[PDB]
Each structure stands twice: as C-alpha cells, then as structure tokens.
C-alpha cells in the first residue's frame with residue numbers, strides 16, 4: 058500500500074513560506090491558508106503595486122523573480138504553469154566556487170571521484186550536516202556510494218537501503234520535479250483553502266509546488282533518523298531516476314532559492330559526468346576485448362558448421378562471462394553448453410525475454426524474484442543474461458547464466474517495516490548472483506554481432 | 513604550409529596587461545616578466561633565486577602556500593597592499609603564476625542564459641543564444657561561433673554583433689587560419705584572450721627551464737605571446753581586440769567561440785570564467801540536440817518501416833518487399849536511388865550506376881574495418897571515372913551486412929547538387945609566411961557534391977539493416 062498514498066494533492070503547505078493560486082487572465086482564486094493571516098477570492102491586478110505584479114505578470118504571460126504588506130517585508134517569487142492555472146510560491150529571502158566545482162567535476166577520473174566531488178560542493182553551499190549521494194540499483198533499492206559530512210554526525214557510506222524508503226509514486230515526482238527541500242520536519246502543516254481545482258474540479262495538484270505539504274510517513278522517518286533539516290536533488294540520466302543527492306542536517310535549515318538552484322546544476326553535471334564514464338569503460342573493454350576474442354572466433358569460424366567450432370572453443374568462450382552454463386535457444390533447437398536448466402529454460406525465459414523487450418536486453422541477478430519457481434534451481438540459475446536475436450518472435454534468444462554467491466550486505470537495519478531505527482545490521486543474501494557491466498555485456502553483444510555473421 | 517610548424521608555446525615573452533612568475537617547489541622564482549623591475553625594485557637578474565614571501569604580503573604569502581598544498585585558480589595577490597589576481601598552475605615541473613589588475617547580478621544573468629541554452633530547440637536557436645550571452649557579459653562588439661568541419665576548415669554558423677559591426681555570417685574560413693599546433697593546444701588550453709594586438713611583448717628572463725633542458729613552456733599561459741602572423745591577421749580584419757573559447761565535445765575540437773572588438777578590450781577572470789562555462793553548457797546541448805534528433809528520425813521511420821515488415825512477411829523475399837517500399841524509404845533518407853549488393857545478386861532499386869558499382873565500391877566498402885562504414889558527398893573525388901555518372905552517383909552511403917566474405921552490401925545514392933559556398937578568400941592564396949589582406953566573401957559553386965549525410969540520416973539506414981536481420985529469423 059506504499060505506492061498508494063496521494064502526496065501531490067495534499068491540500069496543504071509548509072508554514073515558513075506562503076503561496077497563492079490565481080485565475081490565468083489574471084484574477085486570483087484559490088487560497089493557501091498559511092498566508093491570509095499576517096497579510097478569500099479576489100481580482101489579481103491587485104498586488105504590489107505595479108512594480109512586482111505588472112512587470113512580473115507580463116514576463117509570466119507572454120513567453121525566477123524578485124518581489125507592500127502591512128508588516129512590510131520582502132519575499133522570493135517562484136512560479137510555474139500547471140493543470141492549466143498559474144502557481145506562485147513565496148519564501149523568505151559565490152559564483153567562482155560554482156564554476157570551479159564544475160571544473161573539478163570535469164576532471165574527476167573515477168565514478169567515486171565524481172560523486173565525492175559532487176557530494177563535497179553541495180554541502181559547502183548548503184552547509185548541511187550530511188550530504189550523501191544515493192545511487193539506485195535496478196530494483197531501486199539503493200546504496201550511498203559516496204559521502205561528505207561535518208564531524209560528529211553518523212556515517213552511512215556503502216550502506217544499502219530499502220527501495221521502500223522512497224515509494225513508487227514518490228519517484229515519478231522526483232523524476233519530473235527534480236528538487237525538494239523541507240527545512241523543519243516538525244512544521245505544522247497549513248492547509249490550502251480550498252483544495253478544489255476550480256478549473257478541473259478536484260483537489261489542488263501541488264506537484265511543482267516546492268512548498269507542498271509533505272508525507273507524515275517520511276516525517277516519521279526524520280524524527281527517527283534524528284535529522285530535522287533536509288533537502289535533496291534527484292539525478293536524471295535520460296528521464297530515469299538514476300540516483301539522489303540526499304542532503305541532511307541535525308537541526309532545521311533553510312536554503313534560499315538561488316542557493317538551491319546551484320545544488321541542482323551540480324547533479325545535472327554529474328548526469329553527464331557519469332555518462333562520460335558510462336561510455337569510456339564501454340570502450341576501454343572492447344579492446345581486450347578483441348585480442349583474444351577474435352582468436353576463438355576464427356576457432357569457431359572453423360565452420361563446416363558451428364557446434365564443432367564453438368563448443369570446441371566454448372570451454373574457452375564460457376570463461377568469458379562467468380558462464381556457469383549457457384543455452385542456445387531456438388524454438389526448435391535448444392543447445393546447452395555446460396550446466397543445464399531444462400524446461401522453463403525454453404518457454405518461461407524466451408517469452409520472458411522479448412516481451413517487454415523494449416528493444417533493450419534482459420539481464421538479471423535474481424530469478425526467484427522474476428520467475429518465482431527458480432528458487433529451487435538457485436545453484437545453477439540464480440542469475441541470468443539473455444540476448445535476443447531480435448524480432449518478436451522467432452526471437453532466437455541466446456542466454457548465459459550464473460550461480461548464486463553468498464555476499465554479506467549491510468543495511469540501515471532490519472528492512473522489516475512498520476519504521477523504527479536504522480543501526481547497522483547484516484543480511485546474508487541467498488539466491489543472488491554476481492552482476493554484469495558491459496565488459497561482459499558489450500562482449501556478449503559483440504558475441505552475437507560476430508555470430509550473426511553465421512550467414 | 514609551414515603554418516603547422518611555428519612553435520607557439522615558447523614565445524619567450526608574455527603580454528603587458530599583466531606580469532608572471534615561474535617558481536620551483538620552495539618558491540625560488542626562476543623567471544619573471546621583464547616588467548617586474550617596476551614592481552619590487554629589483555631588476556630581473558636580482559629577482560632570480562630570491563624567495564617568494566619577501567616579494568609579497570604576509571597575508572598573500574600564506575594564502576598561496578595553502579593553495580599549492582593540494583596535489584586550479586584564483587587567489588588574490590595583495591602584496592607589499594593593492595589587489596592583484598592570481599591565476600596559477602603546475603607545468604613542466606615548476607609552478608607558474610600570472611598576475612592581473614582589478615556576487616549576484618552577474619550570476620542571475622548567467623543562469624538566466626544557462627537555463628536558456630537548456631531550452632534551445634535548434635542549434636541555431638542555441639548558438640544565437642550562446643553568442644548572445646557571451647556578448648551580454650564580455651561586451652565585445654561582435655561574438656561569432658565557429659563550426660569546425662572534417663578538414664578543420666570552418667564556418668560561422670551563428671553570430672551576435674552590435675550594430676555598425678560588419679558581418680561575417682555563414683562565412684567559411686580555411687583550415688589554415690588555425691594551423692595544426694594551435695588546435696593541438698586549443699583542445700587542451702580551452703581559453704585565450706588577446707586584448708590588444710599591437711601590444712609590445714614583455715619578455716621573460718631567462719628563457720630557461722632550470723628543471724630541464726628547455727625554453728619555457730607557456731602552454732597554460734593566459735599571458736603568453738602569440739604569433740605575429742596572427743596579429744598581422746587581425747590588423748587586416750580590422751578588429752584590434754579578440755578572445756576565443758574552445759568548444760570541446762569529448763576531446764575533439766568541435767568549434768570555437770571567437771569574439772571580436774574594433775578597439776582593444778579586457779575581460780577579467782570572472783568575465784571569461786562564466787564564459788568558459790557557456791562553451792561548456794553549449795558543448796552539452798550540441799550533444800543533446802544531436803542525440804534527441806536521433807530519436808525523432810527513429811520516430812517517423814516507424815510507419816514506413818512497419819510497411820516493409822508486412823511486405824516481407826507476405827512476399828518473403830525482402831528485395832521484392834523493400835524494393836516495393838522503395839519509393840518512400842529512399843525519401844526517408846533523401847537518397848536518389850539505392851542498390852542491394854549480394855556478391856551473387858545485385859538488384860538496383862531506382863537510380864544507380866552499372867558495373868563499377870560492384871567491385872569498385874564493395875572492395876572499397878569497409879576494408880574489414882569491422883566497426884566502420886563508408887560514405888562521401890563527392891564520388892568523382894575518389895573514383896575519378898565516377899565523374900561520368902556523377903549525375904546519379906555523386907554521394908553515397910553504404911552498409912555492410914557481414915564481416916567481408918560474406919560481403920553483403922546495401923548502398924544509398926545521392927546526386928550532384930550545385931550548392932554555393934562562400935568565404936573570405938581565395939582559399940588558394942593563403943621570406944616568411946603571410947596572412948590575407950582582404951576578407952570579402954567570394955562565392956564558389958560546387959561540382960559533384962551530394963547533400964551532407966547526417967547521423968540523422970545515417971541512423972535511418974542504420975536501423976534498416978537491424979530489422980532486416982530481425983526478420984530473416
């Protein structure tokens with residue numbers, strides 16, 4: 058039921074800032090009940106006097122911003138257009154550092170040097186007590202991979218977390234609204250009145266609201282963890298939530314707007330910088346690589362036909378990919394090399410192969426989670442790779458697999474849930490095989506590219 | 513073409529607008545700008561061997577000592593208590609140090625246009641945005657952006673200039689105007705500013721690396737003296753103040769932000785600090801728009817691909833099938849005609865040349881450069897006798913279907929277009945070497961060229977084979 062809470066229409070905001078919803082050919086309609094007080098539906102040309110309405114409205118009408126109360130203070134004006142009406146949020150009220158951190162983020166050589174640099178700067182620009190960089194694995198559980206922190210605050214590096222610490226609907230949001238901050242986690246929520254879209258006749262969609270009332274479930278989270286000031290930035294490699302810059306603080310802390318814009322730009326930089334390294338390991342490997350591969354190709358290219366060619370040098374080509382066993386799978390011809398799974402090799406994997414192929418391949422570390430009955434066969438089938446020969450179908454799919462490996466994984470303790478406390482706790486992990494990056498995959502691809510020459 | 517020979521990293525001099533120091537590990541300053549006599553009282557032969565701190569403030573002394581600790585600019589050199597600007601680096605094995613004379617509103621202007629380049633939907637909407645922003649912040653009379661071609665010749669593809677400033681837009685430039693070595697370092701030294709071009713260079717004394725047997729490598733120098741030829745160049749062009757930024761898409765010199773000014777003009781560190789970022793942000797978008805278009809070409813190739821799947825499912829000869837779909841799929845990639853070359857069967861669909869298509873193009877095909885393709889925009893160039901059929905075969909694109917023997921070949925043909933390109937020059941008219949005196953645009957109209965294939969159009973053909981294969985199962 059975790060992916061079921063509707064967080065985007067919460068009908069409230071946070072007390073520190075105040076916001077207004079207006080009718081677009083500008084008159085103002087639906088009000089946040091955080092701002093009527095220290096300053097109901099109303100006509101919009103009716104804001105500070107023409108200085109901050111008019112010039113700021115025309116810039117909003119045609120194509121950030123800086124903004125007369127009884128109390129006479131000064132606010133920050135951020136906005137956006139969404140579900141067809143005009144939003145406007147208000148919160149209370151250097152350059153070298155930013156560029157030099159790009160300049161350092163550009164020279165960083167390894168994926169760790171990229172992140173601990175990323176982690177480094179956005180702490181030095183929010184002062185936050187802890188700035189962790191959080192990569193998602195495929196199952197979208199995570200691991201804090203690098204970390205930069207003030208002393209005396211507990212350290213969470215190399216630490217795995219449930220996928221559940223941020224649920225499914227929460228994640229589209231961070232895939233589309235790329236940044237979020239709550240300064241005090243014990244803010245008493247101040248409602249929006251009404252929560253009626255006057256336009257679409259239903260609750261106030263508060264999606265690109267950065268003042269939005271947040272989940273009490275994740276409020277429960279930070280009174281647990283004991284950090285009362287928190288912000289994050291999501292990391293987007295091609296519309297996919299790759300990971301998160303999760304910032305923390307023992308005490309509440311506000312980061313002002315142009316101060317929060319810099320934080321994000323860093324993540325964007327890492328979003329190529331990672332993509333830089335994603336691709337130069339992708340060609341550092343195809344080289345060594347060719348030297349030995351091309352050899353046992355000409356040894357499989359002793360093709361009067363292939364099995365006497367391949368399986369003669371398969372005991373060599375098996376050693377390439379951690380091939381505990383493999384299988385050839387044509388609908389008619391299934392050929393095993395090495396250690397064999399028998400019947401749901403054919404139907405429960407090839408149908409499993411190209412369906413939701415998505416034109417990309419299928420690889421998995423776990424099978425008892427992707428096909429439940431693989432649990433009995435973990436000793437030879439705990440993890441599986443498969444490459445289509447391509448149309449859906451005949452879709453003749455080749456596949457290599459891996460046995461299970463007993464690794465010990467650390468956790469913010471007991472992933473067994475409501476949660477309570479997150480001290481270090483070990484789980485021995487069964488039914489899991491050891492992974493793949495493309496010095497095996499790009500080998501595997503450059504296997505069947507090479508094979509397909511069997512014309 | 514000695515152009516590519518002149519050693520430019522060791523001019524033996526720096527520029528007057530600042531002063532430079534060369535120091536070893538323990539701050540024995542080795543060489544110095546010959547205007548340093550006017551700075552501490554000592555003529556240069558006396559600076560030599562002296563220590564750093566004495567030259568300096570007690571404040572500024574320590575603040576460099578810490579910056580050097582980390583195994584990167586900018587400190588301030590208030591040294592005695594006026595304020596200087598400290599850009600440094602290690603190079604050779606010694607630590608260089610260059611010196612320069614003396615928030616928010618600057619920086620809103622940055623993201624306002626950082627996030628502008630993020631929105632840009634075309635290159636030209638992006639580069640009249642890059643060039644626009646560079647100009648808003650370095651106030652240069654003219655801000656051009658320069659595209660490098662395959663030969664390292666170039667083209668002004670966008671431009672922003674204040675009115676009154678004569679325009680070099682859409683103009684081509686020879687590959688000689690930036691010779692080999694300049695590029696070799698513009699790849700690695702991404703920035704250069706020369707603020708006056710009739711400046712009298714301040715030499716460094718000595719011109720010796722004490723570290724090794726060399727003159728002084730002024731590679732990472734912002735202050736290094738440039739070639740006199742490139743100066744006679746810009747007296748000719750009529751712009752007496754210039755700055756360039758290198759636009760690097762992944763360690764290949766892609767192009768250049770070349771700013772110009774009628775009179776001299778200076779850009780402080782911050783000014784061109786933000787500007788190094790603009791070419792950075794821009795080298796990014798170029799790669800996004802590049803690859804975001806590979807997805808919308810992969811888009812419209814959908815409906816008409818589905819066409820020839822149903823046409824090989826029905827006919828099960830792909831030739832019969834695809835060559836029926838021929839009328840459209842060779843418009844998809846704007847090809848004139850194509851041909852399918854199986855070493856056994858050559859079937860020529862639409863417009864195509866005869867018997868030298870076979871061997872003189874499939875033995876030219878891929879050279880067993882397995883990861884490689886083949887193409888041209890002129891074929892009369894490479895098979896000279898193809899000049900005869902240059903009317904139907906001027907450019908070509910051609911995909912293998914295997915490691916040679918089997919050598920299956922698909923190939924797309926494009927005809928000859930009379931396109932008009934123009935430049936300053938006289939690209940043949942390019943004792944010492946000497947730079948051109950006139951830069952008025954001459955037009956040339958080109959014999960035997962196809963339209964430029966893009967990865968845009970290439971990604972099309974690329975997908976075709978990768979489905980023919982899918983089907984053949």
Ligand SMILES: */C=C/C1=C(C)C(=O)N/C1=C\C1=NC(=C\c2[nH]c(/C=C3\NC(=O)C(C=C)=C3C)c(C)c2CCC(=O)O)/C(CCC(=O)O)=C1C
Pocket residue numbers: 059060064189191199201213218221222223224227237270271272274275278287288289301303304305476
């Ligand atoms: C299934 C419900 C949840 C469980 C269990 C849980 O632990 N949290 C749950 C719900 C939400 N989390 C929301 C935001 C959020 N969660 C995290 C989790 C982390 N913080 C960290 O510091 C680290 C790792 C170092 C993790 C994994 C983060 C970072 C965020 C974003 C905000 C922040 O910076 O803390 C969330 C959304 C609330 C809302 O937007 O209304 C929910 C519902």
Ligand SMILES: */C=C/C1=C(C)C(=O)N/C1=C\C1=NC(=C\c2[nH]c(/C=C3\NC(=O)C(C=C)=C3C)c(C)c2CCC(=O)O)/C(CCC(=O)O)=C1C
Pocket residue numbers: 514515518520656658666668680685686688689690691694704737738739741742745746754755756770771942945946947948
């Ligand atoms: C055969 C010798 C040379 C001829 C002729 C010539 O024109 N240049 C020759 C050698 C060098 N050129 C150097 C630098 C340089 N050249 C250019 C060329 C252009 N500038 C433009 O604005 C445009 C078009 C709009 C072109 C085609 C540039 C940009 C530069 C760099 C400096 C700048 O921004 O003006 C050069 C290097 C000198 C040095 O810096 O050491 C040499 C040797």
